[PDB]
Design a protein that fits this description.
GO molecular function, one term (chains A, B): protein homodimerization activity
Structural class of chain A: alpha+beta
Bound molecules: 10-propargyl-5,8-dideazafolic acid, 2'-deoxyuridine 5'-monophosphate
Number of helices of chain A: 7
Pfam family, one (chains A, B): Thymidylat_synt
GO biological process, one term (chains A, B): dTMP biosynthetic process
Subcellular location (chains A, B): Cytoplasm
Number of domains of chain A: 1
Enzyme class (chains A, B): transferase
Strand order of the largest sheet of chain A: 1-2-8-7-6-5
Helix content of chain A: 25-40%
CATH class of chain A: Alpha Beta
Largest sheet of chain A: 6 strands, mixed
Shape of chain A: globular
Oligomer: homodimer
Strand content of chain A: 25-35%
Chain lengths: 264, 264
């Protein structure tokens, strides 16, 4: 996508060499924002083939409040394997915080349900937020939440959403993060009878790993193809009842995939 | 400031009329980002006179982990009066979450201290964050955190910080929020022996209240004056030992102040 390729180029041009937790090394910039008008098409990277199966199942997995990779394995999705323990657990990551944020007084808060109620009863609220950054449980998490905080907004019958991603692996992670959230917006909009608005992506430490340079140069030589259309065949009873089969991406003709090692 | 006046104009030009919690009405946009190179000067609005006393004391108050307006009254700062209860309490807002985030298991986490340790022992960390959005305690808060989540970044010996502000009152609140955080960055940089980098401000629902239109038009007719210089006279033992007297803003010659009613 145009916005995506411009960001890659921006990092190569303005990125500062920086060491990182994985010991891989990166070219990094801090603070970037881009916007995707969901009405223009589904923001799925076309300059390289993205594995839809992984993207979709990861989101449904988050929505189930699941943090054990079992569900993913049942569906042949292995994207989280390297961080799970012997029992396949990742700790109280995304799913757990979204569906059951533990309070100091023993209660559990379902942020998704709360969000649905706010969208349906108070669309003008400036507090329609979901946060995975649970300070009191970070030490139990296998990997601190990258996409950590998002907010919904409703204007002119359209639903928008802004995601704050503290750390962004531009080559491997970003394509997944963008598509994933664009999907959630469509789902939320469907459940709330709203049109899709904009997906605003805001990043903190946005970087390209040193061992993704050839991949990056290769991808930058490609021309972006028309964005596909997302078709949701059915309207489930709730946001928690979607199935992989309910989604259709029409007209997705990407360039060939590009393999790149993941920094653990 | 140029960035600030451009945002005001942007809201007037692209803002959508929207109702809000206060019943005042606003012109609103969603998703905006601006950057201030702290090396260029202290980002204090010059097109209208800002009350430094309030700004500074509010930050020191946050740092003490205080949430009762008593300290503010002792110092003649009344900016939070309308939301405090009979006993002057505001609930577990900013100060409390920064200094004593309550965990489910009874512990309390000092995020500022944690941040200092990360900056000093692991400056390359992509997880140097402080969050005031405590989902489990929002119901006890007098007003949900506007400036809710910020992240520090270190590159080339310089300290940067990005703030995610979910809701922004462009006329009254923004000047305070920008100056306040720019100050915290200088303080943090001093304590960590780093140069100041950039302050990246990212907003969610960014708006102008309907009853601030005349004020806005008046301010937009003014020319921004050179930014002042922040001088920190002393280097305290810790980030928690600063005093109002330690700060000096050199060359602050603003246009006259503009009164505007606050939406409760
Ligand atoms: C974001 C996110 C979720 N995640 C989780 C996740 C966890 C740790 C991370 N760590 C690093 N260094 N970068 C990441 O983007 C990252 C992502 C992903 C993990 C792996 C792939 C990945 O390797 N994708 C391959 C597809 C391989 C497959 O089909 O299994 C690709 O080529 O895109 C994508 C997303
Ligand atoms: C941000 C923030 C902190 N806060 C707290 C705070 C709480 C609720 C809010 N609610 C609304 N509608 N807008 C706000 O910006 C806002 C800000 C502030 C509160 C008041 C003023 C204010 O009235 N300022 C006057 C100065 C008056 C004085 O000296 O006491 C001004 O003209 O700027 C500024 C900041
Ligand atoms: C984390 C998972 C995700 O959803 N998207 C991402 O891009 N990532 C990336 C960020 C970073 O490269 C690495 C996590 O490392 P760190 O915690 O930031 O040090 O995975
Ligand atoms: C809140 C306090 C602050 O630090 N800065 C701000 O601009 N505000 C504003 C945002 C909004 O106008 C109002 C809070 O209302 P709401 O919770 O967003 O409905 O004060």
């Amino acid at each position: 996508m145009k916005q995506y390729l411009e960001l890659m180029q921006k990092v190569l041009d303005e990125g500062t060499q920086k060491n990182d937790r994985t010991g891989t090394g990166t070219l990094s910039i801090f603070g970037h924002q881009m916007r995707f008008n969901l009405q223009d098409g589904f923001p799925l990277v076309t300059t390289k083939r993205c594995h839809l199966r992984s993207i979709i199942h990861e989101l449904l997995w988050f929505l189930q409040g699941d943090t054990n990779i079992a569900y993913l394995h049942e569906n042949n999705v292995t994207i989280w394997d390297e961080w799970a323990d012997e029992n396949g657990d990742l700790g109280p990551v995304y799913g757990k915080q979204w569906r059951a944020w533990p309070t100091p007084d023993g209660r559990h808060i379902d942020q998704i349900t709360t969000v649905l109620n706010q969208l349906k009863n108070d669309p003008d609220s400036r507090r329609i937020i979901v946060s995975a950054w649970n300070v009191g449980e970070l030490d139990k998490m296998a990997l601190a939440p990258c996409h950590a905080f998002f907010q919904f907004y409703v204007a002119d019958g359209k639903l928008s959403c802004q995601l704050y991603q503290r750390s962004c692996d531009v080559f491997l992670g970003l394509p997944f993060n963008i598509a994933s959230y664009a999907l959630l917006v469509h789902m939320m909009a469907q459940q709330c009878d709203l049109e899709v608005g904009d997906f605003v992506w805001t990043g903190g430490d946005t970087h390209l790993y040193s061992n993704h340079m050839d991949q990056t140069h290769l991808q930058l030589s490609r021309e972006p193809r028309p964005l596909p259309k997302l078709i949701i065949k059915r309207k489930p009873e709730s946001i928690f009842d979607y199935r992989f089969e309910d989604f259709e991406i029409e007209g997705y003709d990407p360039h060939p995939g590009i393999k790149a090692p993941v920094a653990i």
